[PDB]
């Protein structure tokens with residue numbers, strides 16, 4: 001009991017089995033057996049003694065086995081539960097992409113009416129809202145500037161009852177957190193409703209507060225294209241209307257001149273300049289994607305486009321970002337304050353590339369002559385069907401999904417594919433009743449993904465309830481190319497995107513062609 005209970009509660013057959021398999025007769029894994037596991041099961045490409053040894057060095061608890069270049073079942077588990085055993089590629093959790101292309105080649109973490117903490121009509125505004133977003137890696141922030149008392153511009157949602165805050169206060173906060181999560185450029189989208197004088201105050205504050213961080217002049221040689229994230233490292237740039245508008249402000253707009261959508265076109269006569277940016281509401285963007293997906297795509301190759309939520313989303317609900325990324329849209333602004341599958345997917349995408357806020361787009365979306373249209377799929381580079389098999393084995397210590405303290409979770413898991421329309425899919429396990437500690441599903445799903453480069457796999461765990469809506473227990477969204485194979489643990493996040501240190505799913509993933 002003292003142990004029985006102890007080790008029995010803390011016993012994981014699925015782990016036992018996996019170990020046994022990799023180990024066979026033996027009670028330990030030799031480097032050779034380990035390397036075999038890494039290759040055969042984990043499909044590691046760097047599978048070899050070096051990797052095996054570092055895994056052992058890092059995770060093997062037994063001094064004996066460690067010294068003797070072996071891995072025990074315990075070390076096996078530890079590796080599996082570590083950052084290396086994470087279904088989300090540890091390698092992609094650092095900046096590894098090419099950060100030297102023009103801004104228009106990356107998806108950019110962007111937020112909508114960043115100052116808001118709640119709804120769009122009467123909820124509060126706060127510098128905190130900016131800090132939170134920035135801490136979540138957001139790169140493109142929104143500032144709605146209005147004239148305030150004492151000649152100090154304030155920020156709030158025009159024509160609503162949303163609380164107000166100061167423009168300067170907002171700038172200081174931004175100043176302080178702009179690069180906490182990433183060193184890459186922050187872009188301030190200014191929606192300017194200020195009088196000429198207050199605009200002057202804006203410019204003053206900008207300069208005074210941002211100081212050298214502020215990009216107030218074109219970079220050298222930045223001639224034909226937008227600068228790259230690298231070239232703009234440590235800088236904050238302004239997006240807004242450029243010469244009703246004082247030059248003080250207007251002159252600070254260098255690479256993001258807010259423009260009205262004209263249309264798309266081959267030459268340089270009618271598809272704005274690389275330093276011109278159009279914004280589209282969700283509704284309008286959809287229509288354009290619906291009618292001219294390829295034009296938009298091609299358009300997005302060398303131009304930044306911003307999309308923002310539909311006006312009816314006064315509750316600050318969010319739309320799916322994927323549908324906009326599928327069109328090459330880079331500044332897909334969501335309401336960062338709102339928990340949901342949308343921000344889940346959003347933050348999943350941006351966890352990629354070191355979480356720096358700039359994720360390089362697939363090459364075919366960086367090809368000015370692509371014929372891609374996520375909506376009307378034809379043969380091309382983007383076509384690379386893969387077969388994904390995901391086995392949801394078990395769950396460990398699922399968070400008590402907010403009830404009180406006497407009901408036990410009745411967990412079930414949902415796995416979804418997000419990507420081009422033809423790839424979207426969703427499957428769910430059965431419900432395990434009254435077990436959040438170590439529910440065991442042992443269910444496998446299989447999906448066919450034709451445009452993996454645009455796909456994300458999401459794991460959501462819910463607390464089933466016949467009576468009511470199933471409670472959301474935890475979630476994890478992984479960009480396709482960061483999805484690791486073999487036995488892995490999916491580390492569950494809360495509604496707010498926070499880590500659940502011990503909440504995981506143990507899965508087995510396989511991706512075949």
Ligand SMILES: O=P(O)(O)O[C@@H]1[C@H](O)[C@H](O)[C@@H](OP(=O)(O)O)[C@H](OP(=O)(O)O)[C@H]1O
Nearest residue numbers: 112113142189190191279306308309310311
């Ligand atoms: O907040 P809402 O009520 O949804 O209003 C729109 C939203 O703030 C957009 O982010 C903004 O985009 P841009 O500043 O990029 O243009 C657009 O400005 P606009 O209509 O003046 O273009 C606003 O109308």
Ligand SMILES: [Ca+2]
Nearest residue numbers: 113142144191
């Ligand atoms: Ca706004």
Ligand SMILES: [Ca+2]
Nearest residue numbers: 408409410434
């Ligand atoms: Ca229950």
